[PDB]
């Protein structure tokens, strides 16, 4: 805090004054060896006390219930024990040359301990870094409907957090996705689509081949006069498949709107018109067929 | 413990006094070389003895049966041997320059040994860190029904531990899930859902197409008058699929309640009404169909 | 052993006496340079000899046949050669500066050799650490029937070892599972279940819809009067599926007992009662159905 | 900026002058110890202040809204706190030998922290490096239709960014692909194709074998006279499969054009001609067949 | 060898004598600087020559054909070149500061070269370590039939080597399994089974339900009187499944023997008795069934 | 370039002359401390300027448009900024002992920065190294048709680059394969085949068994007289399978040619001859069969 910053500045000024006083004492009349070690140790202890006071104030800050009241008594005690152990270990590690006769040994111990700690914390660190990356550059926005072809994250984005992203699925169920997933998979955004697509297949019986041609023309004509079909996009109607029991004609077009209900209504209208056209020309749809040889 | 802390403080004061006495002896009349090494070794031995006493008290604390009585005699002996070997190795490593004439060699040995130990313990460390993370930020709570699309962890959360999470499945069988899984997979929380979804498909016979339209209207009308259907959510009834042997009409709506029994009752009532409506208009459902050509 | 510990203590006392004698000789009248190198080398050789004697005694301990008699002659010779080579390499690396005038090269070689050895031994180290963890915290116990949805480890736990767990499968075949698997997969414990679950589906013919409703009621009534059904658990009987050739009614309940035979008997009794109820109301079960159009 | 560069050059000149003045003071009449440390500390503080001013100017540059206005107030505060902590930690670590009595300990701490940070940031770093590689050497270009057999990235390339690539799918939906994927998967570019391929199978009835031969010839003749078929490419028409209920004849050719509509039209024309040829010779297509033995 | 060991001991004694002579020369009248470098270099060269002689003797030992005659001439030449290069590189790196004026550079080069070499040799090292593990603790023995649910290693163990295990499959084909696989997969040992299991399902037609009950009883009675059935193991006969076209009755029992032939004979006898019992009560087995609706 | 090399040689000569002059000044009458630092700094600055001039000439070489004109203005600016930043960072790190008062701190900073950079660049480095390996030893050649059983890389090799390999697929579509894939997957080369294989199965009706034998003989005779069948390769015709509705006879032979068209023609001729032989002996092919039991 600001008071903590002022205390740290005062401690730094006091440390500088102590160093200057030690230098002056050495220059004029040195006592003990140089007696700089005692002053340095006192300054380090004062800095550690100031840091501990600032940490306690942060713990006793407006958060308060975050560790004290929100968590269970035993759980809070365990968490406090862990954080105290960690902070005292850090304080021992960073400045211990006065009390370290080994110097290199505890240095190596701290180094390899931090190494294993980092290798273990890799996943949480990756989630945090991916959260920062999403903060800076993100492919979506709140309220956008997104999905991925690699995983199952379909839904509408509801909230973006520091660790996980909350998405409202299509059955009104919250889903929490780790942020790191957004750095290794392809993300698709149907919420920013420009048109909806109508694709279908018409299966005609094998003895209607002589009609197939004209039928296709008729269908195309309808797709060129429907007011709900975008004429500037792809529009293909062709016979392109010998199916097992039928001849298949593809239908591939786009609608002018992107909203769900009118898209479905246009699809239904197109399907009904297709049925009427097919039945009007004397052809008919094909059920699965078989040839049976009886004894 | 508090007594252990007091003993450690007394040992630190004694070490400081020994260092001051060594400095005074050097200043006045030095003996041997400086004779600081004997005092430092004695202080280190005293600190090690105090630490061993504290560790024994912790072992002989109220836990007692945790290592002594709970485990088997041979298993307890093996565990005690392992922990003794580890603690003596640590004590040798951290402070051994007095007895180390190699310095570099044993420090390198300790470093690479800690390296392999950390690489091996990676999984347990990850589980512990994920447990801490779940303690701080977790997507669920005790009593919530959760599931994931990546793994099989379906059930209701019963307990959250330091290493694993205990979940009661839907067949009354406990399931233990490692904590690390919660840092790499998507977690869905149906227990926080707002509505239940009713989705179904009506398959009508092919020669019923001329009626399909009006039937859809009727169905929609019913879904607009049912008192158990949420009118503020999605409500879609459209014909949108040419199936192999039928025309498919989708039904997609939501219920006002989230409880299991009333949701199932509403679904059954809706299905019965749909059957009545379909049969009332002269149409009928379609079985799988085939066309047979006999010789 | 205790004799080995006494020998080590005597060697440490002798080393301390040798160091004190070297210091006294230096103080009074130094010979050669300090002649501390010869004394230190002799002390190191004595310590190495004591360690080798202790290792030989451990090899020649009550185990004896573990390496000597149990293994084959050539295999035992190879194992002894390997362990001797490793022991001498360790003795070289831990204390060699009296012979090392290269120091840096040999320490680098030892470090990177231990590094590759650690990466190679990773798997065995992980198994041992997981065994220790299972010793401290384990989700199961001897005699418990366990299974996992990720791997195939179904069976009853028979023994827990330092490296692997032995499980008796349901066809009376032992199965050995590495311990590390228990630190990365979800473990389910059906042996601690509280109730057994009865779930089934009744498929009625399509023209039986007018009866379906009342039939459901009847079934529910039976499930409310069966003395072998737990009335405090979930009990659902509803029509909730339009199948391909039938209407599906779900049945979902729990039994009071957990033993296999009575659970199966109760399931059979419930199934027979369901059949009787269904046939009594004039309905019938539905075979797979089809509609055939002949030429 | 240019002003920042001029300030840095002035600071470097001032540091050189301070070093020269310290050397001259030492040569003529040294004060304190050498009093070079104060000048070096002042120069370092000035350099740090200049760097902080340049960073603030960059933050307050034309971007402005990038961190200040574009992001949320709490999010912007968190980001500013994070970047401030990081930059002050960097300034502490790069030059701290004046204030570091331990030197080695903080060196090890910074090294291990940077190590874990790098292992965490691996993914973002890989994406950035793959973006650079795509900038230099890339297999596609803007507007090209691409696809991969390993993942689902089918679509037309729309934009290439520093981190992700934006591709317009065939249903007018944007898709964002991480750049790293382009360094480990095979990328196919149909947008640079030279011809379109027509492949199909003709299934004739089993008692039509006596005709099969001549039919093949006829088909080949047609494929040698169609003006839309590339005669310089592969052209194969052969009977090469005993199917379950038919004899299969392969058709394999290429079209002269690459555009979608004319390719589909040519395929339809070829299929109609094939049907006419097959029916003209007295043969017929084969439905799935079966032999039934009645009781 | 023993002669090599004697030569090494003589070389060590000579090196100690050379060091003592150098110390005496320095004490009495030093020549050149100390002239210890020439003596140390000569001792190192002698040690290297002795090691090379021992290595050549090992190469020219009773193995002989292992490298010389067994391998091809070009292959043997390549192998000898590789081993000589490695030997000379080791001799350079282990002790080279007399000729190394860089010291740090060559040690860094050796360290990172060993690092890459170890990372590459990881797999072979893992196989060797798993071989040692199997030597000490192994779940099977020679002649045991083993299998795994994770991989395909089914067969009878024939030989255990330092690197791989040779297993005779059930079609008399040798199979070589790397040892490392035995440290990460579950190993099942059917060769140590105690009983063989008989499991089957009886499918009765739907209109035999009124008989099902008594039929089950009859079957159970037979299973309680068969002399080849273990009465102390599990024995379950119940109706527990509504199949698509039948009612399913489970049969689950164990045989007293474990050998293949009598187990198969008992299974056949039980099946024949089951058929006789089923046909005696008027019921019959059910073929797949269907309901056909003709136009 | 050659001019750059001459400039570098001149700079090296100037640096040697400066060192000699500094040594001579120290020997005769030293100024300042030794005043060798200024000369070394000037030489380093001159070397850096020469290197920068050479780099600018390489940028302004015949490539020119590679960075300047080919890329977009903003993209080129970003790339130039990145490369300049990297160059200045390298120049700072390689020689900074004059300006480094910390020496070790920025040393570890650069070390761990290079560590993360290498871990990120791993993939591109692997692709480059695999390209070099393919340059030296490669299993294919330009124009060869290759495929793999692990991935989908089927096609004919068209170009081999430093990073990716361009392969023309069988539908005239280019495909770019990363080079690293060629170091971990099996590569098959059908372009170097020696013969084409004809394999098929003849399914005869069940009541044709009395003929099967002689039929096989007939078929074999034909395969021994066909001029397009390689008689020196495998030639097997045997009845070896009880199919569901037929008896299966295998046919397995090789053709003398490897070209596509003649291989297909020979296969068609063999199939027609097989049909004629089968129908000549009174047997017939078998459709899928079934037995129906009517009520």
Curated annotation (Swiss-Prot), chains A, B, C, D, E, F:
One term of GO molecular function: mechanosensitive monoatomic ion channel activity
Xref: PROSITE patterns: UPF0003
Domain of life the protein comes from: Bacteria
GO cellular component terms attached to this protein's record: plasma membrane
Stretches of the chain found on the membrane's Cytoplasmic side: 60-86, 130-295
UniProt-listed SUPFAM superfamilies: Mechanosensitive channel protein MscS (YggB), C-terminal domain, Mechanosensitive channel protein MscS (YggB), transmembrane region, Sm-like ribonucleoproteins
Keyword annotations: Cell inner membrane, Cell membrane, Ion channel, Ion transport, Membrane, Transmembrane, Transmembrane helix, Transport
Disulfide bonds: none
Location relative to the cell: Cell inner membrane
Membrane-topology descriptor: Multi-pass membrane protein
Oligomer status and interactors: Homoheptamer.
Name of the protein in its database record: Low conductance mechanosensitive channel YnaI
Upper lineage: Bacteria, Pseudomonadati, Pseudomonadota, Gammaproteobacteria, Enterobacterales
């Amino acid at each position: 805090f600001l008071f903590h910053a002022v205390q740290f500045l005062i401690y730094t000024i006091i440390i500088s004054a102590v160093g200057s006083i030690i230098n002056y004492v050495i220059e004029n009349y040195k006592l003990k060896f140089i007696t700089p070690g005692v002053i340095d140790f006192i300054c380090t202890s004062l800095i550690a006390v100031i840091l501990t006071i600032k940490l306690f104030l942060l713990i006793n800050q407006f958060e308060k219930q975050q560790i004290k009241k929100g968590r269970d008594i035993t759980s809070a005690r365990i968490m406090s024990r862990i954080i105290k152990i960690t902070i005292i270990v850090v304080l021992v590690l960073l400045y211990g040359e006065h009390f370290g006769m080994s110097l290199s040994g505890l240095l190596t111990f701290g180094g390899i301990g931090g190494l294993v700690v980092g290798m273990a914390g890799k996943d949480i660190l990756s989630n945090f870094f991916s959260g920062i990356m999403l903060y800076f550059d993100r492919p979506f926005s709140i309220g956008d409907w997104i999905r991925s072809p690699d995983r199952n994250i379909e839904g509408t984005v509801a909230e973006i957090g520091w660790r996980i992203t909350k998405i409202t699925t299509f059955d009104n169920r919250p889903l929490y996705v780790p942020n790191s997933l957004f750095s290794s998979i392809s993300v698709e955004n149907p919420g920013r689509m420009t048109n909806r697509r109508i694709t279908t297949t018409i299966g005609l019986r094998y003895e209607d081949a002589a009609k197939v041609g004209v039928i296709v023309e008729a269908v195309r004509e309808m797709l060129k006069n429907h007011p709900a079909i975008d004429q500037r996009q792809t529009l293909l109607v062709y016979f392109n498949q010998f199916a097992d029991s039928s001849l298949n004609i593809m239908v591939y077009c786009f609608t002018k709107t992107t909203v769900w209900a009118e898209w479905l209504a246009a699809q239904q209208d197109v399907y009904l018109k297709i049925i009427d056209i097919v039945q009007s020309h004397g052809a008919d749809f094909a059920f699965p067929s078989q040839t049976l040889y009886m004894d």
